[PDB]
Amino acid sequence: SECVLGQSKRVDFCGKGYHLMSFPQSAPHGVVFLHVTYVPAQEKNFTTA
Amino acid sequence: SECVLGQSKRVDFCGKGYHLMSFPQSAPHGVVFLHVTYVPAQEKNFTTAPAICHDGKAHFPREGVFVSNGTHWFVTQRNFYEPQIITTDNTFVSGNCDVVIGIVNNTVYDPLQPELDS
Amino acid sequence: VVIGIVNNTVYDPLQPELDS
Amino acid sequence: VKQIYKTPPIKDFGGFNFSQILPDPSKPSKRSFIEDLLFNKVTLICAQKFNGLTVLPPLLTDEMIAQYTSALLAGTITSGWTFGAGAALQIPFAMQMAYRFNGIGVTQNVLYENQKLIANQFNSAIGKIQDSLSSTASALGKLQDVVNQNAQALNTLVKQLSSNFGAISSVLNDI
Amino acid sequence: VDCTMYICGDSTECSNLLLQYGSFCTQLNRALTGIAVEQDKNTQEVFAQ
Amino acid sequence: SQSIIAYTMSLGAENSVAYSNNSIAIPTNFTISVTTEILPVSMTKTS
Numbered sequence: 541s542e543c544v545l546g547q548s549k550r551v552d553f554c555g556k557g558y559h560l561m562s563f564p565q566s567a568p569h570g571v572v573f574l575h576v577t578y579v580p581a582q583e584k585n586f587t588t589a
Numbered sequence: 590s591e592c593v594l595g596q597s598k599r600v601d602f603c604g605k606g607y608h609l610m611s612f613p614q615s616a617p618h619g620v621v622f623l624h625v626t627y628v629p630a631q632e633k634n635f636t637t638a639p640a641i642c643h644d645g646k647a648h649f650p651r652e653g654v655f656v657s658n659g660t661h662w663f664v665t666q667r668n669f670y671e672p673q674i675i676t677t678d679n680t681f682v683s684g685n686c687d688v689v690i691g692i693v694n695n696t697v698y699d700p701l702q703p704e705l706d707s
Numbered sequence: 708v709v710i711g712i713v714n715n716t717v718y719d720p721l722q723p724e725l726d727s
Numbered sequence: 728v729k730q731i732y733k734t735p736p737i738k739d740f741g742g743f744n745f746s747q748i749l750p751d752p753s754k755p756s757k758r759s760f761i762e763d764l765l766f767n768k769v770t771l772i773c774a775q776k777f778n779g780l781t782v783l784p785p786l787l788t789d790e791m792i793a794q795y796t797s798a799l800l801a802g803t804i805t806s807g808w809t810f811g812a813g814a815a816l817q818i819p820f821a822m823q824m825a826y827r828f829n830g831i832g833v834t835q836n837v838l839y840e841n842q843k844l845i846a847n848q849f850n851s852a853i854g855k856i857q858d859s860l861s862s863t864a865s866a867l868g869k870l871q872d873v874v875n876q877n878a879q880a881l882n883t884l885v886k887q888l889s890s891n892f893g894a895i896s897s898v899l900n901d902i
Numbered sequence: 903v904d905c906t907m908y909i910c911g912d913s914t915e916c917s918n919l920l921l922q923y924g925s926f927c928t929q930l931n932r933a934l935t936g937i938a939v940e941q942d943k944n945t946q947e948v949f950a951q
Numbered sequence: 952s953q954s955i956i957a958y959t960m961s962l963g964a965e966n967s968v969a970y971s972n973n974s975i976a977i978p979t980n981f982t983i984s985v986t987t988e989i990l991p992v993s994m995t996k997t998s
């Protein structure tokens with residue numbers, strides 16, 4: 541309901557980190573989720589105010 | 590705690606589709622919830638474009654989408670039909686038109702012109 | 708009131724077109 | 728989902744490749760490319776007939792589950808989350824990614840300029856699942872463990888008939 | 903809990919007689935081991951995030 | 952001539968939505984429905 545049919549505002553519920561979407565995949569006596577999330581990279585040391 | 594005590598953004602949890610509110614009702618060894626939903630209807634599809642080019646700079650709809658009825662272009666929220674003229678007040682600019690793909694050339698109206706009289 | 712506020716210039720988009 | 732959605736053959740998603748997830752008519756079954764690997768990896772099977780044991784086939788066959796999954800896939804691709812709350816209003820995937828970027832807190836521009844790299848990264852990440860699943864047999868751990876637990880429980884129940892529980896013999900006819 | 907020790911203990915006649923009850927002790931030991939493993943599993947899931 | 956049939960259950964309706972990169976569907980008249988939900992709370996306090 542949340543990961544696939546919408547964007548989950550929760551954290552670490554749909555994949556790792558900020559959630560984008562999930563493409564469901566079936567399996568014998570189960571289901572496999574292709575969680576898609578947003579992961580930042582290349583941090584810097586900028587000053588703020 | 591979510592459907593009744595507040596508004597829930599969860600999908601198909603407090604109601605099928607966009608949830609609005611809920612009204613609990615007493616039942617014997619149970620709870621009857623009168624959830625209130627919000628389902629869009631009366632579908633209609635138009636042409637669109639990701640960005641808009643005015644003078645070599647790419648425009649984006651900010652909080653809406655670029656649509657058009659074939660004669661006039663408009664900026665409206667994706668969830669409702671509220672067309673508005675492409676203006677800087679509801680449009681933000683970043684980058685040039687070359688990088689963007691699918692950008693459609695159009696003119697962005699300036700709300701300052703009416704006030705620049707006299 | 709603000710603590711740690713830094714001083715820096717802020718530009719006005721309407722300054723070039725202020726003249727009527 | 729109350730309706731079975733489908734993806735038009737054009738599949739003009741602006742570089743986003745859904746072959747691994749969408750149905751693959753080439754294979755004998757309509758399940759997606761990934762689905763085949765999962766089913767093969769997951770699959771004391773079909774060896775319980777004596778002692779009155781019987782197994783009821785599931786109401787929703789594997790083909791029906793695959794069809795439901797394909798319908799959900801098609802709804803998610805074109806209509807995004809709109810079909811999960813009402814009419815299936817199609818939106819381009821290139822712009823659906825931008826719409827979602829807004830929800831997390833990223834402006835649509837970032838994508839509007841980086842769409843090529845974003846689509847390439849999405850394809851690589853989704854496309855890398857095949858190799859990870861093939862080279863790792865523990866990716867299907869939960870289903871394998873539950874199936875093995877059920878199988879061993881059934882085997883123990885069957886074997887319990889071989890114990891006399893203090894009786895002279897374990898066979899009623901012999902007794 | 904050691905099923906054989908708990909039911910019988912050091913005695914050998916009781917241990918021999920208990921073999922007539924199939925593999926109940928094995929099932930109980932397996933269940934206890936599963937619960938013990940699940941305890942650490944929950945601890946790790948809750949804390950090791 | 953009513954009787955009992957044995958068929959393959961339909962997996963819901965079939966609706967293929969036209970999808971193109973240059974087309975977007977936006978609603979114009981929303982509707983509001985009421986979704987009733989039932990959930991048991993407790994059993995009888997039998998002893």
Ligand SMILES: *[C@@H]1O[C@H](CO)[C@@H](O)[C@H](O)[C@H]1NC(C)=O
Nearest residue numbers: 581582583584585586587588
């Ligand atoms: C960032 O700067 C701080 C102090 O200015 C320093 O302690 C830290 O190591 C720096 N980190 C990186 C990744 O440059």
Ligand SMILES: *[C@@H]1O[C@H](CO)[C@@H](O)[C@H](O)[C@H]1NC(C)=O
Nearest residue numbers: 632633634815816968969976
């Ligand atoms: C999309 O537009 C076409 C015409 O361009 C129309 O026939 C069709 O019904 C529309 N579909 C939706 C879901 O708006």
Ligand SMILES: *[C@@H]1O[C@H](CO)[C@@H](O)[C@H](O)[C@H]1NC(C)=O
Nearest residue numbers: 690691692737739971972973
């Ligand atoms: C949409 O698809 C058509 C043909 O299917 C193509 O000519 C057009 O360039 C596509 N739109 C964009 C923005 O590339």
Ligand SMILES: *[C@@H]1O[C@H](CO)[C@@H](O)[C@H](O)[C@H]1NC(C)=O
Nearest residue numbers: 588589708709710711712713
């Ligand atoms: C930040 O830390 C520096 C070093 O301790 C100090 O001199 C300065 O007053 C601090 N400013 C604020 C706003 O806390």
